[PDB]
Every structure is written in C-alpha cells, then in structure tokens.
Amino acid sequence: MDLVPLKLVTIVAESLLEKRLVEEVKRLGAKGYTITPARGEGDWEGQNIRLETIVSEEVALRILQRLQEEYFPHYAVIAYVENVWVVRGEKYV
C-alpha cells in the first residue's frame, strides 16, 4: 500500500474561467486536475465548474493565496482545501 497524505484543493467558478484557472494551478505546481460541471443559485452547459486538484501542502496555500488575491475580488469564486491520502500520490508532489 503506497498511500501518502496530500491536499485536495477545490475551486468553483463560472465555466468561462476554466482556461485561466487551469493555467494558474499548473503554473503554481499542480500536476493534474479534474473538472465536474456545476451550477448554483439560478443546464449543465454555460454554468459553473468544480475544479479539483491534488497538491502538496505548500502548493495548496500558493494556489489559495493566488485565488484570494487575483480572482476573489473580481469574480464569484469558492475555494477550499481538504486533507486526503492518495494512492501513488508521490507523483503529485
């Protein structure tokens, strides 16, 4: 069993911000990401996306700080982080 502790960062925002956000997390160290369509107050196309990425503790805070600084003031964004244990997670570090 190769299981290691990492962080799962989740971001919810308009789907139109996808390219920018995907670029931001890769730029900050993320080695992958998963997207799920999503919606909120007020159909799965043209709404929001839930972007998730598995990263190390340090990269997680880099991403969150970048979102708080550059995206939160100008867009409706939700961002949070959870603790996870990942199979062969060494690769995401």
Add this chain to the structure above:
Amino acid sequence: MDLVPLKLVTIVAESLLEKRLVEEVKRLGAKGYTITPARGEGSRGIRSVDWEGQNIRLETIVSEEVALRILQRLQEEYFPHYAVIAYVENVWVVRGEKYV
C-alpha cells in the same frame, strides 16, 4: 491568507428534491450551495431525457452548528421518505467568514 475552518455538507438525492433541499439548507443558515450531477446503481445519466431518474449532489459550506442542524433535519424529514445520502467533512475555506 484568509483561511478558516468550516464544514462541507454533501447531500445526494433525486433531482426533483433540489428545490426543497435548497430551501431547507438556506432556512437553516447556509449562505450558498453548489449542485453537481450524480448517478449510479441504475440512475440516469446527465444527458438523459428522463429527468426524474437523474440524481443531484448538493454541497454547502457551513459552520459546525449549522452543519448538524442540516443533517438532523435531513435525518428527520427526508431520509424516511427518499433515498438520500448525507455526510459532512472538514474543510478550510478562503474568505470563509462569509459562510458563518
């Protein structure tokens, strides 16, 4: 870095329940929510014409106290009549003070 500890409550149920579940969490104190598609065990996919057979997942960021109020309400009012999944997880949230 404005990060605070909160709870993420997740509810999975039939799609027709969306309106009532949203009203219910807002009534109990949640300030926002996110809906995503869910299926499995026979349920219909995201592109199906059959909307009734589709499920939805509702996620909401709330305080510890509001989380259990929501979970209790689900256990009392919804679980007895619908196939529902509901759980809670610990999260640290950017600018989370607005969800309390």
Add this chain to the structure above:
Amino acid sequence: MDLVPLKLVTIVAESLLEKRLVEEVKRLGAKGYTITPARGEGSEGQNIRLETIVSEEVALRILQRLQEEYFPHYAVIAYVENVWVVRGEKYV
C-alpha cells in the same frame, strides 16, 4: 443525530472502466456508490468519478486492489477522505 465516521473513497478513471470498478468495490465490501462525470486536460472519451462510503478496512482493501490491478495499466486517480455520515451504519 445518527452520525458515524466512515471513509469516502474516490476513484477517477476512463468511463469504460465503470463496469469493472463498480464490480470491484462491491466485491471488496462496498454497499453502494455514486458516479459523476469528470473531465481532465484534453477536454464517452471522458472520465467518471466513482465514490463509495465504506469502513476504514474496506477502504484500504479497495485502494490496495486499485494499486495492484489497475494503476499499472490505466490512468487512474484514487484517494480517501474522512467523513461522518448520516445513518452510516448501513455502509458497514
């Protein structure tokens, strides 16, 4: 309040793997699951995210099997989170 601690195992993989993965988690002890569409870089010809609430022992059994049988041959992501579940006794 009927709330108990369990584990939430998440697996992201090619959608054609759905059938095999569902059978694998059921075989190893999972008493239910949910599937949600998922897409990654380069976006059916798509992925799925399988989630299952299980006991801590069943979670490790599932993850072990994924590492052995699937990770070497397919592009898969698998992880576990701690969760407290309403009427969770039914998943153990």
